[model samples]
Target: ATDTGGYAATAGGNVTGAVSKTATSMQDIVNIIDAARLDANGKKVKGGAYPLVITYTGNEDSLINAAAANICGQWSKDPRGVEIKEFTKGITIIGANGSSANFGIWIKKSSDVVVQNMRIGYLPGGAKDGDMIRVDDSPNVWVDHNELFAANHECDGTPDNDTTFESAVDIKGASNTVTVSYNYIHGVKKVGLDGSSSSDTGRNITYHHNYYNDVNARLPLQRGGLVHAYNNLYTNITGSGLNVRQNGQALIENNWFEKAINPVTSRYDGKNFGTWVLKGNNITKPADFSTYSITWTADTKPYVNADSWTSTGTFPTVAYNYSPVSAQCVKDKLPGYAGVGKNLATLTSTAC
Candidate 1:
């Protein structure tokens, strides 16, 4: 039996939980979810809304990597092999690791999954470009109350193990209905929440009530769509706070920004351009980097021209009632007053 405490234990065990008392690999967790029935008896179990909880503790990056690989690997093997209805309530992943590593949790599935109350930091010696949390192709996911930190370390001589790097919580693919809230994210050499990529279609996303400090190393290209960003405290960012690319609906509102070097850019290449609603965002100049500031200046007249995008409107000037600093501004100023927008806004506001 493999020891459940270490990554080596998990790696040595069956990737799939085919054996008992063995350290559970990520593949094992997936297999547990992917299994048609619970036991070998082959009884028919209704395939909708199975809830699972994954708890991690100690220095277990290898175990987590195995889990991420297993989930993503399984999805890559069969895109439609698993159905969303099978895990609607989704799984709750809890991190018990006292120390952090190069990368933490990475998911590439769909439906309701919640990751909460975790600490993800860089190892004393690890690889660069490792993210604390990477969400890929997952929908209805809720990530909250987690702490992510970036630490300095010396990597092994191998090129694969270099450490002086950037890390963040990234959401990619058609990750719809994602809610990232109330987390303490800092010391990352990148954006706190990066939803960028044309390959993914993001919709109904929300980022709120998070604390970000000393970030802005890289920006993920926004190929995904429809992001709602608000109510966060950002300090010392080198790049733009929000990078909107291609075409998608974005609601940037009600956040306190301090010492930000780059302004949010809304880009459009014509092909499939999207709309952005910027209202009630409080942006302050960083005392040191005030010289390198760019305002949100895009031509709104021609929303799209030959795959190109122009910006329109500035903060505090936009026609919205919420203050640029109120946390509830995004919820209050959602577009399409009728239909699902209204209901969603109401629900979110009430929940918040």
Candidate 2:
């Protein structure tokens, strides 16, 4: 059975509702989720999985605070916890009033979940901080193919606001095996992929194939185990790109960096050269660039102990060729290519 209008539930098992009109008050949307439930006859069903889809087609947009409070409220009451999933794939959560007081989709619980292919933007509110998508203390989750924008500006004359913790994706407090990938993230003056651990042992995380444009410091910080970051493009960041601290064996490879303030900075112990392999990267100097090449200044002595490190690869040099082995040409010919196209080609057969 399907109930088609204004937050209705089916009597037997299925539940469906449509919210075409704008929620007049903040609590108006909250009340919809509060009364939403699956019923068998007249009695309320317990611990049953059902799908909830809220379609927002209202012309007037505003911040819906605790808009999902009732949805979360129902989940908290269930003994097995309710699984409330929303599909706004073709809809938008536009902020007409302000940004800081709004959240696109905020959920806090422990359940298997998925959010994808959504656009959240137009939040011009002058409030402090908010997130596009925020989840805490949950596991077995997946967030992909989503575009987010937060428009809360700070009054403190700073670039980013104090309350505008506008991250594209934010996870905190012991959430494990979180995977963020294949997404285009921009225009938020905060960290792109951020994770913090209350305990010392956070594990099994990966970030890949994402583009970050014009972002600010402390990005992709790993507080705990086995972080794998690779194949991403980072452009116009004001702080260090990958901050690998307090983790074991971080694998970074095949990443592109352009005009990044600082590329890579490592701190804490057990971070070794073997533990980090910088390979196959295209790092170019930005146009109108005015900065020193990576020179070993005295200030860098503490971060990298030059006295104890060793070189392990053969460095390449330039070579030149001249007619019939002129003295300079004979001397400059690279040993590997020596005597190639001449009668002395036989000499190339032997190790030079």
Candidate 3:
């Protein structure tokens, strides 16, 4: 279970002023968004102003609201999320220096948002309802330079606590053209989910240069989307790793999977699935721990094109909103710079 607390409301406000500081609750965060949102004609009127500056300093826990609604929404939510729906554009949430704000926020049906440069951790006491942030049916979103921890510690060197989040980030619905990079994600059943259901056809989502550590797998559950994953690190994995199921198209390259189990499951889950083009990925499993160690899965489609792959070579060019680090850099140095509370600048330091 991975749980989060955010906000929800139907009304908004008119913006005509500068920014303010010190938000006391999730609602306060909402108020800032309302004011920063686009004008009636859908234009940013502030000339790129800052009406709210909530940095990740002072107290990370201060951003938490225990009484707020649970973050991980069930499958039945009409719009597919909780806490915050229709997250508006032009509202930026930055953390203080060495800040670790706690949250379980969700985004749905909105776009042009950025949540970056901070440590976003869970409150730590609640059971995992899954996911610190969930993006559904959205576009042009940037989730970068952050460290995200989930409520679940299902495996690895933990003292058997009761917390299990579905994923640190769950990108669902038509979450197309989204970028999830340069972040540290760990301690959840799934690190990320590109497609939440069979009907989900989110296209062109990129997962690059992120570090996936400890706790089980699903560096992503690639259910129904096209993903470009590269130069990432996977360490100390317990259960199965990366799954490409239900026609999820992916191009996985140049990642370092250290001590991970199974590693990559292509054409996954014994259902209608897609294929993966793997090249330059470094896989290392010290001991084939699983009796059924999976090298690569080409799970057959029960009938049609049972042994066919739609595309395997020459990955289409992506018009990246943010360029990802070269595989050489990630393979050369992602681990040393990963983890919460570390000097984030090391991401660009020479050779790691």
Report the C-alpha displacement of residue 38, candidate 1, in angstroms: 3.0
Runs with alpha carbons beyond 4 Å of true place in candidate 1: 1-37, 40-50, 55-89, 96-103, 123-129, 151-166, 192-196, 217-221, 267-275, 284-352
lDDT of 3 by residue, 1-352 (tens): 0000001111111123434454444555665565555566767654233333444343454433441234332211222112444644234455555555565557777654455566665433334443567778766566666787653344333224333234577788866667676688765555777777667755667776788877576667777667777778777677656667776667777676656655665433555656677666553232333422333323344422211222333455544433345555676678666544554444552454
lDDT tens digits by residue: candidate 2, 1-352: 3211101111211124322324333344354444443344545444222333332222222332232222222111212111233321111122222222233455454333344444444332223234556545544444444444432222343333343334556666545555554345555555544455424445445554455666664456555455555555666665455655554345554455556655555433334321333444443223212342221222332333112212212222212111122222212232212111121121121222
Per-candidate TM-scores read 0.57, 0.53, 0.68
The C-alpha RMSD of each candidate to the native structure, in angstroms, is 12.5, 18.1, 8.8
TM-score of 3: 0.68
Give lDDT for model 1: 0.46
The model with the greatest lDDT is 3
Task: Kindly indicate the candidate among 2 and 3 with the higher TM-score.
Answer: 3
Off-target runs (Cα >4 Å) in candidate 2 are: 1-48, 52-102, 122-129, 150-161, 192-194, 197-201, 267-279, 283-352
Q: Of the pair 1 and 3, which is ahead by lDDT?
A: 3
Rank by TM-score, highest first.
3, 1, 2
Ten-residue region with minimum lDDT total, candidate 3 = 1-10
The Cα error of candidate 3 at residue 335, in Å, is 3.2
